[PDB]
Amino acid sequence: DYIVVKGAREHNLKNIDVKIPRDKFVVITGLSGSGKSSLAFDTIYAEGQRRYVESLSSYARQFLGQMEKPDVDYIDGLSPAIAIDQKTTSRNPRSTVGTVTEIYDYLRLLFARIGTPVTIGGKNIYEVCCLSIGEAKEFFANLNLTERQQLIARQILKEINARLGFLVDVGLDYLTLARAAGTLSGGEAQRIRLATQIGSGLMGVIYILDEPSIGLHQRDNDRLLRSLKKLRDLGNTLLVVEHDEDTMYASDYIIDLGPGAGSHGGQIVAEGTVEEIKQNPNSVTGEYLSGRKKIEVPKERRKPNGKWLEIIGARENNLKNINVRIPLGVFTCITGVSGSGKSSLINEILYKRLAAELNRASVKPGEHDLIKGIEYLDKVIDIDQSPIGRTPRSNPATYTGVFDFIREIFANTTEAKTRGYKAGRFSFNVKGGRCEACAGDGINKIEMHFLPDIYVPCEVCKGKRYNRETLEVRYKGKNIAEVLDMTVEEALEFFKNIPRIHKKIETLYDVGLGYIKLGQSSTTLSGGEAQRVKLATELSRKSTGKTMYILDEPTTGLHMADVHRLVGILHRLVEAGNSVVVIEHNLDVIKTADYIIDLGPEGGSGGGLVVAEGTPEEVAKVENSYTGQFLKKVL
Amino acid sequence: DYIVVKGAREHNLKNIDVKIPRDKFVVITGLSGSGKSSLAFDTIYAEGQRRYVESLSSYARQFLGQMEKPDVDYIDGLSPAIAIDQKTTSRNPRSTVGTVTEIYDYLRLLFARIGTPVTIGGKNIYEVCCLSIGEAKEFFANLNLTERQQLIARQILKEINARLGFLVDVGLDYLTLARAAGTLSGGEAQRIRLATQIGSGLMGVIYILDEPSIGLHQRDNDRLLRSLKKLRDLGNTLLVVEHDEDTMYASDYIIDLGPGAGSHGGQIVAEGTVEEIKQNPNSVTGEYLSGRKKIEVPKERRKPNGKWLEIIGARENNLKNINVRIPLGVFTCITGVSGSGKSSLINEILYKRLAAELNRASVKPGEHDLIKGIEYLDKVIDIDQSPIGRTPRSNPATYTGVFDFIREIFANTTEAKTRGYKAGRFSFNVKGGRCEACAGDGINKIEMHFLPDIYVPCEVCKGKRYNRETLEVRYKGKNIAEVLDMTVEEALEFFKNIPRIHKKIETLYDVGLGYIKLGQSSTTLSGGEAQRVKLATELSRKSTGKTMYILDEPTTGLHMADVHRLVGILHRLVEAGNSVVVIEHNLDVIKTADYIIDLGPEGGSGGGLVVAEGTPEEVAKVENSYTGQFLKKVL
DNA sequence: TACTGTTACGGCTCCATCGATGGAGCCGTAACAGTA
DNA sequence: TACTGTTACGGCTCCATCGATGGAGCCGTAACAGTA
């Protein structure tokens, strides 16, 4: 009846005791970096999987793999749990939709066990696989089988019917089972990843969802919420780590983590229903929901000054040769249903053509006739929708690029010049200044065979990643280890007289990363922290006053406060005299835009046509687009 | 707090609802074939494993293997469960004790991760493996390790220490890790099989024990009971399916099944503590425990009539060249601690020499000088301690040997003679008279890849295993299918005028198998039913009036009523004028013997010497043997 | 001549036992080419 | 001459993905050899 956890200290949790109700829709909210993933996926799922795995043999334990033991005293009422990782998964070119969703295995088993010779229903496996999902579902539903065949193929057809029903319900009826899984959009890939594990509902099983609404429109989010409620009605428990308002409004219990991020968070601020969350002043999320603090919609929206970008004959992917006009000098946002073809337009035609024309790139653009107005811009800066890599040899300092400047400054010191030291000796990834015992890792990870891995600190370098000779040289009383061991605010105060580093450190601080350390490993970075680091890396570049920013879904893993900060930054950049084009699904960012280009009205082959275009007030008057329907309530 | 099961109909359970307390020592008792294994191992363990496996991926599900879905409505309060199968497991010659107990893997990991070059504590892996278990435990306990080494090897040494402690506690301190696992006795192999899975105790895990006291003396049973109580004190639940009195007296809760066996059982008769079980008249086990029905100890014990069998210089295995005298014409029982060397004496010297001298066998006997008194016997009949095979092409009718006579009788009919039918056409294991569609199996088993297997009956033969041509010929109004489809009592009534079949059917009925069908498959046979079938197969052979019976542990899987029936049969055979030598651990059988040969006083290299010898009253006066100490209380 | 012990000889069934390769991203280094 | 965009080139790291062989037992058939 409860999932009571007492004494949890994983990562940055400050020994919190939480009682999670069972057979409910419990949602964990909080700021980015607060510790929600460490609370759910790193503790509850880890403990459940470890308990279920320890009872198996050595072969099974070494094959499945045992997760690291969480630093939790005891957990009561645990049940077998299925969880989906927050980090997105790349797909091999050979993989298709059917193999990823595991429906291909059931199709093969059905054809092998029931197929009359390899032909069931007058069709071979090739015709079934090269078929639409809705067509396959309606063909399998109306299947005439004999008594013996129906008896044999019961648990084979039931699972296929359930999976196809879920895939139709989420809205993927236009896909084919032979289509490659790597060419799907963000929302389609997210839905496929969900359906791989949640389509066939079990009973008495805890379902852990780590941001299941990535790249999904509000209309798709409503359908997924209805599907999740239907699954929960089977008698399961759902724990959803989300940032959207709809999920909070459609949840029975809300658990809030905070009150900040990093070292300032990891606690529990408020608990209860939505009304209890709103009435609690200590909750930042509750205050934002109640409207006490909100994103300010502009009173007057800027109008184009006669400068326009014209795209003529854009027919990339599913685009039906449309003509789109993007105003220059104003904040432009593009909205559409998941799969309508907005990224396939912008990131595959406009950004590539702009880069080829201005930055002298060598990337082939999309299928289009011509673009008018390229001469009005000087350079193009873009943020892709692809995820960032995670390696132990990476950190914010070496990712945003301040590490090169810091190393050059350290090599410019008198002691380094006397000792004949270059800039490469001060990096832990090049031999010469890295402790050879631990290969500059700082710690040594001992890998077992079936037992969980154990981390032991290095003794030669004490964990400072550098030998004694390199740490001797100090700049302004600090060596490189203490340089990498201070937060962003301390680095901002330290490098205040060096503009080259100060600009990038100020950019990092602006997005809200004043608590992070310059040497924190990338593998330990949160999803929201990694997204904000990627945003700051591109926003730290110099602007010439006539530039175009192309941001593709920067809301991934960002709380309401973080997106408010990003909105403020983008508005300041626009007011400076630059043009920003944002492909967004969050209503808060769109409701402040000065221009909206709407695509749809559906996804897949059914979309690719401009439905609405103009200011948000004018777009809200169009009943054809669901974006207008949502903007009616938002405005 | 409970393991509540409602609506269980697996095998022969008549929809019983049982509430099993948690964190206790619950013991399930009942007659042989009542349905205890079907209640615990086929339902609770199956449901728990299925629930824990369904949450994994397709690869994991197909690798681990999903057990058949039990026919149970719902089970509440299940947790991860570890169970040990009742059926014994043979061991390959290459396997040793360390590899079977999984301590070799931990030794290899310790030597690879901590060993200084492959040498920890001044010894290589060869010296550690070629060492006594007690010596290895005391060497590992007093291990001097540095700070880093102790930090690294914590969960490696803890498991080794726990496993060696359990192996010392059970009483296997005389074994070596390099000793082959196939050469151990029954009790040693049982203890090794236990230690493989129960040595390292977990928390909040259900432990299911399926007869864990096979081939164990009472002294070893007490030690194992103390170890089980220590493990249960860790906060686990133990469900023990046993037949001994000590386990019932040392259990918190007792659940009694019955009231009979086969189709007459599968119910629940009484529940509560030991006093509640005794006070309930409906429980056969309770009545036997309370002394209302008990095995009658003879008032006067027969004395030898001057006929003796002398074994001189028996030095097989661990025997220290002892001289043993076995009286002839009386019921002789041999008692000793597990591993003392009683089977290695009898079954390896006496039986082999008797078979070679009388039955003209070609089996090499053990290491001994000579045997005096072989000329006093005519033939030797023995029952080994090895388990019986289980194949779908086997049944009691074809195992006890009545199938050959039945087939000859069927081929002797007028219709068979007219049709040119031989005896082979009436067997389902030979082409010609079996349904070729199912190859005589009767049912077809469809095998999936990861899903549980589904059994579908054959349609060509309707499940009668024979075609239409063979079923036409009927003997006394019954064809071969109806012959195989009647119980043992019906066969006894049917074949009452044919002594050749009547003798074997009466032998089968005597041991208490009047409910079994002649065509029931061996794979579906219970352990006790298989043991009784094996006993009847050898007891059905003709006796010449001067014969020797050598029964090696016939109590395996037999209830008190079954062993009472066997004791009566053996006493009648002895009174007929034959000599019976029984290697036994059950006190009920020994307490009625007319002569006892005691071996010990310990196991392994510490035993092999005759401690006591004579009538049970005289043996009970010896304080050196634990058998005398137990007979003091028994008598 | 029949019953009963052993053996062989063929066929069927059950059960124990034991991570690597390709694709993608990131960091450090070098080089080339525009702007300022 | 400095800042900044692009490219290449080598090295390190992370993540997706996909049951068989030998040993033992049992059943049906045939043969050989003692007892009765």
Ligand SMILES: Nc1ncnc2c1ncn2[C@@H]1O[C@H](COP(=O)(O)OP(=O)(O)NP(=O)(O)O)[C@@H](O)[C@H]1O
């Ligand atoms: N391995 C680690 N070692 C140390 N700190 C870590 C590690 N992993 C994460 N952290 C920090 O722990 C805090 C909480 O991380 P995490 O629980 O992943 O955040 P989160 O609330 O789920 N954020 P987000 O996913 O963006 O919503 C952050 O400050 C992380 O930087």
Ligand SMILES: Nc1ncnc2c1ncn2[C@@H]1O[C@H](COP(=O)(O)OP(=O)(O)NP(=O)(O)O)[C@@H](O)[C@H]1O
């Ligand atoms: N390489 C490709 N070949 C064929 N079809 C494609 C390809 N890439 C994308 N598509 C399809 O084109 C449509 C639009 O894709 P895309 O424009 O990437 O989506 P999107 O608008 O960014 N959706 P989302 O990321 O969910 O916001 C979808 O039906 C995709 O399945």
Ligand SMILES: Nc1ncnc2c1ncn2[C@@H]1O[C@H](COP(=O)(O)OP(=O)(O)NP(=O)(O)O)[C@@H](O)[C@H]1O
């Ligand atoms: N697969 C099966 N199909 C049909 N009947 C079966 C099957 N397996 C077992 N049985 C019968 O079900 C009854 C109970 O079997 P089981 O539950 O194994 O007995 P048990 O009480 O554990 N006996 P024992 O192990 O000797 O103590 C017996 O009459 C068996 O012959």
Ligand SMILES: Nc1ncnc2c1ncn2[C@@H]1O[C@H](COP(=O)(O)OP(=O)(O)NP(=O)(O)O)[C@@H](O)[C@H]1O
């Ligand atoms: N082939 C063998 N080689 C060496 N030692 C052996 C062998 N077989 C058995 N032993 C040992 O000889 C001792 C007696 O074995 P054995 O006589 O078979 O035991 P037992 O008395 O029948 N015990 P149990 O079956 O438990 O009642 C034990 O220490 C065994 O480990």
Ligand SMILES: [Zn+2]
């Ligand atoms: Zn080091």
Ligand SMILES: [Zn+2]
């Ligand atoms: Zn058939």
